[PDB]
């Protein structure tokens, strides 16, 4: 349990959906509570707030300070450095930034309910599989019609590194439990995903009992001439 420094990155929720992202400079492994000094190099925006010392499972202390009002700098790929003086002995520094430069925009796929779970007219599982995102953190929400569903109704599974060779990618899954009654009525359900290396902010996909698997599809091919113009 020796003194050590680390920087806790801003949450994706604040960067994409919220209004004020912040960075936290944290020392841990400290025997002497309080008395530590936390100085940010980019002393702009709003003053950092020093938080109270808290004991961990070993009785050592965690002491940190948070710098708010930093979303505008991160949206440009900027950087932050923290220099700290231990409450006991030494000078320690570190840096972070919001720039990885080897990202893969997400691919959001939706899997409709299994036949085994919809033939009974009970409850359905809509599975959202978001694939490929190099900075591992995802914002997953679900929509029922045009309204957001409460987060207590989602099971969102943490990101895991994908196996194999090549560029690193990760999967995230979430399951929404849906009443077969509203699926029968035709209510639309959609998965909403956030990830910074992606344009126009967020991404979404929607499914219902029309997009799902059909039965006895009718296909009509028409040969055309004219000018080859579709009207």
């Amino acid at each position: 349990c020796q003194p050590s420094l680390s920087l806790q990155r801003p949450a994706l929720e604040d960067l994409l959906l919220g209004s004020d992202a912040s960075i936290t400079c944290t020392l841990n492994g400290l025997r002497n509570p309080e008395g530590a000094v936390f100085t940010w190099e980019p002393s702009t925006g709003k003053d950092a707030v020093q938080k109270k010392a808290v004991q961990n499972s070993c009785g050592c202390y965690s002491v940190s300070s948070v710098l708010p009002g930093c979303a505008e700098r991160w949206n440009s790929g900027a950087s932050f450095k923290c220099t700290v003086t231990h409450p006991e002995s030494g000078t320690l520094t570190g840096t972070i930034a919001k720039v990885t430069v080897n990202t893969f925009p997400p691919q959001v796929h939706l899997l409709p309910p299994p036949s085994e779970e919809l033939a009974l007219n009970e409850l359905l599982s809509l599975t959202c599989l978001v694939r490929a995102f190099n900075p591992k953190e995802v914002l997953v929400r679900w929509l029922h019609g045009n309204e957001e569903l409460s987060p207590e109704s989602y099971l969102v599974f943490e990101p895991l590194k994908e196996p194999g060779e090549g560029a690193t990618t990760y999967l995230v899954t979430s399951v929404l439990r849906v009443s077969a009654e509203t699926w029968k009525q035709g209510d639309q359900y959609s998965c909403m995903v956030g990830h910074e290396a992606l344009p126009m902010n967020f991404t979404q996909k929607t499914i219902d009992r029309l997009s799902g698997k059909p039965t006895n599809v009718s296909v009509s091919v028409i040969m055309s001439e004219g000018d080859g113009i579709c009207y």
Binding site: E147, E148, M192, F202, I229
Partner: protein, 131 residues
């Protein structure tokens, strides 16, 4: 009475579908689609360039048929946000079979007037591309 799930302008492929009740029970119901494709008999490999061979091969990727690339708003608690609706629209332009009547298709031609060559932009879809 059918719901239109997809209406593409490059590959006319109106994909309607509707809840057709079954013959077994009134509760059980069936879903059926109407993939209505329109294949051009007279069009070149590419429609942006008129010096390409005629098109005798057509493939219709359903995902590409039912696409969505018009951002939408979403009431995320208290922050309405813009929404990409697919992971496909990403432009190299996509391969296109038929002309979109609501888009302007043109070609450059070296015509010689008053003694000199000039690059004139001529319409390929003259009944469109109006103000």
């Amino acid at each position: 009475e059918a719901t239109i799930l997809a209406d593409n302008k490059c590959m006319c492929t109106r994909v309607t579908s509707r809840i057709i009740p079954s013959t077994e029970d009134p509760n059980e119901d069936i879903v059926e689609r109407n993939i209505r494709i329109v294949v051009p008999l007279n069009n070149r490999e590419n429609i942006s360039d008129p010096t390409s061979p005629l098109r005798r091969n057509f493939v219709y990727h359903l995902s590409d048929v039912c696409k969505k690339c018009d951002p939408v708003e979403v009431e995320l608690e208290d922050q309405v946000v813009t929404a990409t609706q697919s992971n496909i629209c990403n432009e190299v332009p996509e391969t296109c079979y038929m002309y979109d009547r609501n888009k302007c298709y043109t070609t450059m031609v070296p015509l010689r007037y008053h003694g000199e060559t000039k690059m004139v932009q001529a319409a390929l879809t003259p009944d469109s591309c109006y103000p």
